[PDB]
Nucleic acid binder design. Structure first.
Ligand SMILES: [Mg+2]
Ligand SMILES: [Mg+2]
Ligand SMILES: [Mg+2]
Ligand SMILES: [Mg+2]
Ligand SMILES: [Mg+2]
Ligand SMILES: [Mg+2]
Ligand SMILES: [Mg+2]
Ligand SMILES: [Mg+2]
Ligand SMILES: [Mg+2]
Ligand SMILES: [Mg+2]
Ligand SMILES: [Mg+2]
Ligand SMILES: [Mg+2]
Ligand SMILES: [Mg+2]
Ligand SMILES: [Mg+2]
Ligand SMILES: [Mg+2]
Ligand SMILES: [Mg+2]
Ligand SMILES: [Mg+2]
Ligand SMILES: [Mg+2]
Ligand SMILES: [Mg+2]
Ligand SMILES: [Mg+2]
Ligand SMILES: [Mg+2]
Ligand SMILES: [Mg+2]
Ligand SMILES: [Mg+2]
Ligand SMILES: [Mg+2]
Ligand SMILES: [Mg+2]
Ligand SMILES: [Mg+2]
Ligand SMILES: [Mg+2]
Ligand SMILES: [Mg+2]
Ligand SMILES: [Mg+2]
Ligand SMILES: [Mg+2]
Ligand SMILES: [Mg+2]
Ligand SMILES: [Mg+2]
Ligand SMILES: [Mg+2]
Ligand SMILES: [Mg+2]
Ligand SMILES: [Mg+2]
Ligand SMILES: [Mg+2]
Ligand SMILES: [Mg+2]
Ligand SMILES: [Mg+2]
Ligand SMILES: [Mg+2]
Ligand SMILES: [Mg+2]
Ligand SMILES: [Mg+2]
Ligand SMILES: [Mg+2]
Ligand SMILES: [Mg+2]
Ligand SMILES: [Mg+2]
Ligand SMILES: [Mg+2]
Ligand SMILES: [Mg+2]
Ligand SMILES: [Mg+2]
Ligand SMILES: [Mg+2]
Ligand SMILES: [Mg+2]
Ligand SMILES: [Mg+2]
Ligand SMILES: [Mg+2]
Ligand SMILES: [Mg+2]
Ligand SMILES: [Mg+2]
Ligand SMILES: [Mg+2]
Ligand SMILES: [Mg+2]
Ligand SMILES: [Mg+2]
Ligand SMILES: [Mg+2]
Ligand SMILES: [Mg+2]
Ligand SMILES: [Mg+2]
Ligand SMILES: [Mg+2]
Ligand SMILES: [Mg+2]
Ligand SMILES: [Mg+2]
Ligand SMILES: [Mg+2]
Ligand SMILES: [Mg+2]
Ligand SMILES: [Mg+2]
Ligand SMILES: [Mg+2]
Ligand SMILES: [Mg+2]
Ligand SMILES: [Mg+2]
Ligand SMILES: [Mg+2]
Ligand SMILES: [Mg+2]
Ligand SMILES: [Mg+2]
Ligand SMILES: [Mg+2]
Ligand SMILES: [Mg+2]
Ligand SMILES: [Mg+2]
Ligand SMILES: [Mg+2]
Ligand SMILES: [Mg+2]
Ligand SMILES: [Mg+2]
Ligand SMILES: [Mg+2]
Ligand SMILES: [Mg+2]
Ligand SMILES: [Mg+2]
Ligand SMILES: [Mg+2]
Ligand SMILES: [Mg+2]
Ligand SMILES: [Mg+2]
Ligand SMILES: [Mg+2]
Ligand SMILES: [Mg+2]
Ligand SMILES: [Mg+2]
Ligand SMILES: [Mg+2]
Ligand SMILES: [Mg+2]
Ligand SMILES: [Mg+2]
Ligand SMILES: [Mg+2]
Ligand SMILES: [Mg+2]
Ligand SMILES: [Mg+2]
Ligand SMILES: [Mg+2]
Ligand SMILES: [Mg+2]
Ligand SMILES: [Mg+2]
Ligand SMILES: [Mg+2]
Ligand SMILES: [Mg+2]
Ligand SMILES: [Mg+2]
Ligand SMILES: [Mg+2]
Ligand SMILES: [Mg+2]
Ligand SMILES: [Mg+2]
Ligand SMILES: [Mg+2]
Ligand SMILES: [Mg+2]
Ligand SMILES: [Mg+2]
Ligand SMILES: [Mg+2]
Ligand SMILES: [Mg+2]
Ligand SMILES: [Mg+2]
Ligand SMILES: [Mg+2]
Ligand SMILES: [Mg+2]
Ligand SMILES: [Mg+2]
Ligand SMILES: [Mg+2]
Ligand SMILES: [Mg+2]
Ligand SMILES: [Mg+2]
Ligand SMILES: [Mg+2]
Ligand SMILES: [Mg+2]
Ligand SMILES: [Mg+2]
Ligand SMILES: [Mg+2]
Ligand SMILES: [Mg+2]
Ligand SMILES: [Mg+2]
Ligand SMILES: [Mg+2]
Ligand SMILES: [Mg+2]
Ligand SMILES: [Mg+2]
Ligand SMILES: [Mg+2]
Ligand SMILES: [Mg+2]
Ligand SMILES: [Mg+2]
Ligand SMILES: [Mg+2]
Lengths: 252, 52, 112, 86, 50
RNA sequence: AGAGACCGAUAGCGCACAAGUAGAGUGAUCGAAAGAUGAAAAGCACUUUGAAAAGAGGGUUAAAUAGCACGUGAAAUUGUU
RNA sequence: GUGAAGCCAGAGGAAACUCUGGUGGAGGCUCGCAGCGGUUCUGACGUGCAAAUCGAUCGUCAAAUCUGAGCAUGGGGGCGAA
RNA sequence: GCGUGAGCCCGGGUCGAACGGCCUCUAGUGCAGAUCUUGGUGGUAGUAGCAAAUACUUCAAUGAGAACUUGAAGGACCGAAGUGGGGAAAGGUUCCAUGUGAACAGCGGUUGGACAUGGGUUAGUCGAUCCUAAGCCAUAGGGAAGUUCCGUUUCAAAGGGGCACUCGUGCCCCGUGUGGCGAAAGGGAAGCCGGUUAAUAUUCCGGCACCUGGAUGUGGGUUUUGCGCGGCAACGCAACUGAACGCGGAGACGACGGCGGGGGCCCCGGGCAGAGUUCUCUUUUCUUCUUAACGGUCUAUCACCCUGGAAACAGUUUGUCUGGAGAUAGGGUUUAAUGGCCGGAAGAGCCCGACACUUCUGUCGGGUCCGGUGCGCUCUCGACGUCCCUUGAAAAUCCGCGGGAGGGAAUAAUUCUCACGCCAGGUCGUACUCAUAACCGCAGCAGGUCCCCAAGGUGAACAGCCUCUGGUUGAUAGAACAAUGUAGAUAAGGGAAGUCGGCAAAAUAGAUCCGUAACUUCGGGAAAAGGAUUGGCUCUAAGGGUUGGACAACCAACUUAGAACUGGUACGGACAGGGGGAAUCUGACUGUCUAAUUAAAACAUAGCAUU
RNA sequence: AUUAACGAGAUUCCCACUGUCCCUAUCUACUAUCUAGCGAAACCACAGCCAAGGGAACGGGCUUGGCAAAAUCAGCGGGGAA
RNA sequence: AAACUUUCAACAACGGAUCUCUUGGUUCUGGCAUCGAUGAAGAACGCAGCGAAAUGCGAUAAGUAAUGUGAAUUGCAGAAAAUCAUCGAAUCUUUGAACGCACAUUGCGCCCGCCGGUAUUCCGGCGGGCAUGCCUGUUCGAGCGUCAU
């Protein structure tokens, strides 16, 4: 048989993400002395649209504590942020929307965005439009913080991890139907070469495990073991259950 | 062009105002050297170049 | 109504092959290759066009005099004047507020 | 395909190689299909005896290598015949 | 094309110079066997590879 | 460098020759055909017919039915008688 | 060609929102030329003009439209609206 | 002649240098086949055929020879998405002149992209060169037995600025970076007109310019404890110091819609000069009447400034929108020439007219104008607007500013982006074709191959049809008109009875006015179904701008409506141009694929669901 | 399962329409045709009139009969198990 | 009876077999050990009085020096040896392991020196240089890695 499309995707080549129109990655400031001990003030210059990203980004200018230059950063814009707004990043920053604070100096029950998995990593969690991370609780003796992720998972991160107060802008982007093949094409044409998608059962046996046959049918259980070989993992990988979800799920 | 001008000056005491050059389809270079207005190209060709 | 041709080896309409039509003293219609239009410099604060400065290609500014390139006030170029006035008023007000805040803190928190 | 598609043939996969002179330098890869330029070693394979002998030593001028046997025969000597002008 | 590199122009020059019939006095030499230019090339017959 | 119970121009190396050449292929690569007048060019002066190519005379040679489509000159196939 | 929002005016009514003239210029809308494609004649041709062309008739034609150059993916590999 | 035979010997002819018998030895040793290999040659056979792209004809010259050479004349086609004029790729001399036997130009050939002999491509301004893009290759390192793979800033001690001596070498500051290749359509310093050759020209010649770099002058400006002046302001003026360090701008950006300005083209009127027609008519029909780069000067929407303070809200676009965050209004500033005038520049170009002449020399006269129009075509600019779960490069380079480091002779220079002036600008490409013959399809192949410019009429219209400029008249010819054909049509009466099947063909068709069902996702269906009108001529009305004094006069196109008359009862008169309806199966739709037998119900799609 | 709209998808019927047909006829151009010039290819054991018989059970050849007269042109599609 | 077809013969065509030849192959045997950063093999472009190719050569270009021989070369022309052999001295364009960085560009640089243009800085001409890995040495350095005053 052939190498299947899912296997080919990992080679790169035509499946590499598009990057020309992306200006800079969305990252916090590097964790420095000012952010560790007090706060630093930055000015929002513009709210820009980043192709391939649903959420808008905010360009924020800060002063260098050690040089005469000025530094422009690219944050994920939280909804409610505006051009000409002062934002504050640090331990002693006020608890207002757009401020970047360590989770230790944040009370329980507030939502943040671009939460660092570890301090200094400049943001990893809850960075997509309409998404946020909730600060469930604190453990000061352990120096840790329990948070709730957009997926519903519970995580524990060091209290020094930073986050931006508020909710990622971009609202309910997925609330309107795409309604058109062209609109799906435009959505993915700035992300990746993954659209359109041909069904495996419409292929031939040389091309996919779902293969051919005189009727379009999978012919064997579509749930595939977690430890199946590469080239076998087509369908529902390591599926605990299948079928329509007809009630609440114990797992979360 | 600079080498051609200097070579003409040294070899024939010829002063030029400009020199145009091309490379012919046979691979050799052809140079049109315009003399100064005070010197007559006909006399130069007759006396030094053997052209009539 | 004679028809014209490009006068250069570029045969494509590539935003750099801009041409206009002229009539020569020889009495025939011809093409003149023209450069891109000049662009007016913008304010660094509000982004509007700056009055009093010609719209040229970037290399062309190196051959005109300074008074034609700037206006005679603080931030002559690159700021629009309204922004300069806003800067002046804002700076004065922030320094005044800072002075009164420091005097108030010294008088009401260091009085003992 | 065929005649109609042959009309679109106005590009060049290969150009002239600086080392071997053949029109075998891939214009995009910048590698010669014949001599292996720009690799230091000349491309040569034992499964093509014909290709090996088309460019083995002796198929060219041998500007320097042809004079070695005479110099060896005379012992790589230096100097001039005892009694020579100069 | 009108746009040419120097190398291509030089090779075209060499081909043009080689495109000629053999001299007549060659055939009068003793032991001559050359009857005609066997490597003659025409722009309409055989394409030179650059 | 010397030899052969070897081959003798469809043979012998692909190549006895301006052969790894001419030519083909984008390319890697593929890759031919093609030797012999005569001892000596002595390679046909000159006349004539023809627009010319050529022909007919004439000449050279031991020989031109050895005339650069050249030693000999088979068969297939063809013309005349 | 059709004529989506938005806008102007006038009619009703009590309200609220009904109606009627206009304006406007949206749409993977539509007729149709070039381009792109290739349905039928199962036409021509079928030792062809052509190792896939020719004619008529057809599909689409403002956007999942057509196309150049540069560049990337190389054989059990690639690429595939399959 | 001998031998059963394979064969052997001899006679005659041709021919020109070696060869044979006998006994042994030796082998690449015996051909009708193998769709055998190479080469050569037949019948077929003077046969199939040389029939797409409308088309040739007369006279003359040339020549041995002319349908396919040339001149003139006529008749035609391409008909501005050209058979026109130029380019990109590709070709490489096919370009020009002269000559020409054979071969090639599937007929001929005096002709040729053929053959032969000689020529032809001129750049500081056009490109490459410079920059970076997707991307590729180094480096530090790390893998790999290795050819080499990753790596492109990454676990690297990776650089650039100034001062000082007779003399290069003495120091002092800054540092986070620290490669190359990659676009003849992206970015980008600068050249226009006229003329000229057989063949090049934005390259040559003449005139008139510009840019970059480097040098130092003259004038001008500013100052002398210092680095201009004016304007309320927007800002202006010929300059009018300014290190590091930093900030900003430009380069620099999508698609589409209507509107407005400008250039060019088209069209109309008058005049000038020439030409055509002129039985008759036509103050007629056609052509010419031009103005470059570079500059000076005056203007040109949007915006911005000043006064002032708006509801009885006002201003205002086709559309919108705007205003106590300051509108209308009045007055200014300013970005923006492909606008007017002037220099260039009439001296050019062009058009007429008249006098020289083997040539050498042409010479000399004149003239080269004024208006109008527009849903016109094309390019460009501007202000608005729409769409996006799509927001539509980078870098080199150039400029401004914040800052204030250094430096700056009351009788002398003056760290000047002002005027004038001086010097220089290397290298490679440049011919020609770009296609029914210059490229690729074995070829001079009805195929394929990326662009620019784009006339008149009809008409909604780069539809079809006809024409102008320009280009061709090139595709083997002559004669005849049998069958069968290919292509184009017409048929009485019937009207699908043909056939697997209405395949093929026919019928319908533009515009205006009426009228339009079931069903429906309320958007459609719909041009449903159907019906009427359409020419010519003579009139009438309406739809605008300007000025006077509610009318008059002047100016200007077209679009619509009404009436009479009239003929062939005809009029979208050619061309152009939907047949329609009642249902069933099926895929929702738009879209995509088996290049060269399958375009579909297959694939994709949005939506839904699962992991 | 249904389904408006859409379809060079498959199917049945109706109106219109017509040479699809009854049942064919006629016209035009270009061929074919004849000429000048030029000029292939496929194919080919040898060849080329039949009837029957036998035969490898369908002969051009064999057996027995019929018969049987140069050299040819345009068509033609029975045979050559072309 | 001609023509046509066929058969036979002579001559003439077509074609290149046969015979004879061979400055070529093929095989065996013997001797020898000599490429290259002092730039190889290979490639490109040029060089002759009249050459396209082959052969030879490299702007000193169908070759220069030197030695030996001893009168040619030759198709023509020309001149006062030779397209001779040998070969120890030289030249040796652009390249190429290819080396300033590149190269699909006859592209873009830096250093030293000289000669001109007013010139340490810019321009032009000329000459010589500028790759990488590693070894030895030299010199200048870094590190509280470390030793004494
Ligand atoms: Mg596999
Ligand atoms: Mg799918
Ligand atoms: Mg399938
Ligand atoms: Mg499988
Ligand atoms: Mg399985
Ligand atoms: Mg299924
Ligand atoms: Mg089953
Ligand atoms: Mg040049
Ligand atoms: Mg293509
Ligand atoms: Mg290298
Ligand atoms: Mg060689
Ligand atoms: Mg042989
Ligand atoms: Mg032979
Ligand atoms: Mg051979
Ligand atoms: Mg080839
Ligand atoms: Mg012979
Ligand atoms: Mg005789
Ligand atoms: Mg004889
Ligand atoms: Mg003889
Ligand atoms: Mg003979
Ligand atoms: Mg015979
Ligand atoms: Mg559509
Ligand atoms: Mg098409
Ligand atoms: Mg057919
Ligand atoms: Mg046929
Ligand atoms: Mg077709
Ligand atoms: Mg028809
Ligand atoms: Mg003999
Ligand atoms: Mg044998
Ligand atoms: Mg035989
Ligand atoms: Mg046999
Ligand atoms: Mg054969
Ligand atoms: Mg034959
Ligand atoms: Mg015939
Ligand atoms: Mg035919
Ligand atoms: Mg004919
Ligand atoms: Mg024709
Ligand atoms: Mg005559
Ligand atoms: Mg003709
Ligand atoms: Mg026509
Ligand atoms: Mg016409
Ligand atoms: Mg056009
Ligand atoms: Mg032309
Ligand atoms: Mg053209
Ligand atoms: Mg190219
Ligand atoms: Mg010509
Ligand atoms: Mg001639
Ligand atoms: Mg012919
Ligand atoms: Mg002939
Ligand atoms: Mg001729
Ligand atoms: Mg003649
Ligand atoms: Mg020629
Ligand atoms: Mg330029
Ligand atoms: Mg350059
Ligand atoms: Mg660079
Ligand atoms: Mg690498
Ligand atoms: Mg390593
Ligand atoms: Mg570059
Ligand atoms: Mg460009
Ligand atoms: Mg000039
Ligand atoms: Mg000039
Ligand atoms: Mg200057
Ligand atoms: Mg002064
Ligand atoms: Mg761009
Ligand atoms: Mg004008
Ligand atoms: Mg018009
Ligand atoms: Mg007029
Ligand atoms: Mg003017
Ligand atoms: Mg106002
Ligand atoms: Mg003037
Ligand atoms: Mg005058
Ligand atoms: Mg256009
Ligand atoms: Mg216009
Ligand atoms: Mg040209
Ligand atoms: Mg060709
Ligand atoms: Mg074509
Ligand atoms: Mg028209
Ligand atoms: Mg009209
Ligand atoms: Mg038209
Ligand atoms: Mg033409
Ligand atoms: Mg023909
Ligand atoms: Mg018919
Ligand atoms: Mg009838
Ligand atoms: Mg009837
Ligand atoms: Mg009926
Ligand atoms: Mg029936
Ligand atoms: Mg029936
Ligand atoms: Mg039909
Ligand atoms: Mg019809
Ligand atoms: Mg409706
Ligand atoms: Mg219906
Ligand atoms: Mg109707
Ligand atoms: Mg009427
Ligand atoms: Mg009608
Ligand atoms: Mg239609
Ligand atoms: Mg469908
Ligand atoms: Mg596709
Ligand atoms: Mg197919
Ligand atoms: Mg297939
Ligand atoms: Mg098909
Ligand atoms: Mg339906
Ligand atoms: Mg026939
Ligand atoms: Mg004939
Ligand atoms: Mg026979
Ligand atoms: Mg029988
Ligand atoms: Mg029987
Ligand atoms: Mg029988
Ligand atoms: Mg038989
Ligand atoms: Mg019998
Ligand atoms: Mg008979
Ligand atoms: Mg037949
Ligand atoms: Mg038959
Ligand atoms: Mg047979
Ligand atoms: Mg007999
Ligand atoms: Mg013969
Ligand atoms: Mg022999
Ligand atoms: Mg060398
Ligand atoms: Mg070096
Ligand atoms: Mg070195
Ligand atoms: Mg380049
Ligand atoms: Mg330099
Ligand atoms: Mg000097
Ligand atoms: Mg120098
Ligand atoms: Mg040098
Ligand atoms: Mg040292
Ligand atoms: Mg130390």
């Amino acid at each position: 048989g052939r190498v299947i499309r899912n296997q080919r995707k990992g080679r790169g080549s035509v499946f590499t993400a598009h990057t020309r129109l992306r200006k800079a990655p969305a990252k916090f400031r590097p964790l420095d002395y000012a952010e560790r001990h007090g706060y630093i003030r930055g000015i929002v210059k513009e709210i820009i649209h980043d192709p391939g990203r649903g959420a808008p980004l905010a360009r924020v200018v800060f002063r260098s504590p050690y040089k005469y230059k000025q530094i422009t950063e690219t944050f994920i814009a939280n909804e409610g942020m505006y051009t000409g707004q002062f934002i504050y990043a640090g331990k002693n920053a006020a608890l207002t929307v757009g401020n970047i604070l360590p989770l230790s100096s944040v009370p329980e029950g507030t939502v943040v965005s671009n939460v660092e998995e570890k301090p200094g990593d400049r943001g990893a969690l809850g960075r997509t439009s309409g998404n946020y991370v909730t600060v469930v609780g604190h453990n000061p003796d352990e120096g840790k913080t329990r948070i709730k992720l957009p997926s519903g998972a519970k995580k524990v991160v060091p209290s020094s991890s930073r986050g931006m107060i508020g909710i990622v802008a971009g609202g309910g982007r997925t609330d309107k139907p795409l309604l058109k093949a062209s609109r799906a094409k435009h959505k993915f044409a700035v992300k990746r070469n993954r659209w359109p998608k041909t069904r495996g059962v419409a292929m031939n046996p040389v091309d996919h495990p779902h293969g051919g046959g005189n009727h379009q049918h999978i012919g064997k259980a579509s749930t595939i073991s977690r430890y199946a070989a590469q080239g076998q993992k087509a369908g529902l990988i390591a599926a605990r259950r299948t079928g329509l979800l007809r009630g609440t799920q114990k797992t979360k | 062009k600079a080498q051609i001008k200097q070579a003409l000056k040294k070899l024939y005491d010829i002063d030029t105002v400009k020199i145009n050059t091309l490379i012919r389809p046979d691979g050799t270079k052809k140079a049109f050297a315009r003399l100064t207005p005070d010197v007559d190209a006909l006399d130069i060709a007759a006396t030094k170049l053997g052209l009539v | 109504p004679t028809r014209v041709t490009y006068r250069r080896r570029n045969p494509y309409n590539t935003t750099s092959n801009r041409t206009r039509v002229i009539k020569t003293p020889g009495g025939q219609l011809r093409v003149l290759h023209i450069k891109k239009r000049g662009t007016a410099p913008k304010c660094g604060d509000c982004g509007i066009k700056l009055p009093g400065i010609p719209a040229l290609r970037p290399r062309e500014y190196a051959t005109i005099s300074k008074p034609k390139k700037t206006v005679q006030r603080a931030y002559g170029g690159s700021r629009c004047g309204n922004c300069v006035r806003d800067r002046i008023i804002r700076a004065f007000l922030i320094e005044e507020q800072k002075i009164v805040k420091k005097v108030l803190k010294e008088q009401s928190q260091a009085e003992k | 395909k065929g005649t109609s598609s042959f009309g679109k043939r106005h590009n060049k996969t290969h150009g002239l190689c600086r080392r071997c002179g053949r029109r075998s330098l891939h214009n995009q890869k910048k590698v010669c299909a014949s001599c292996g330029y720009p690799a230091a070693k000349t491309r040569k394979y034992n499964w093509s005896e014909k290709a090996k002998r088309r460019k083995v030593t002796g198929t060219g001028r041998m500007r320097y290598l042809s004079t070695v046997p005479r110099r060896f025969k005379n012992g790589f000597r230096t100097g001039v015949p005892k009694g020579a002008r100069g | 094309p009108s746009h040419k590199t120097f190398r291509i122009k030089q090779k075209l020059a060499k081909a043009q110079k080689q495109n000629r019939p053999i001299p007549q006095w060659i055939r009068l030499r003793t032991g001559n066997t050359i009857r005609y230019n066997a490597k003659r090339r025409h722009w309409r017959k055989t394409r030179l590879g650059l």
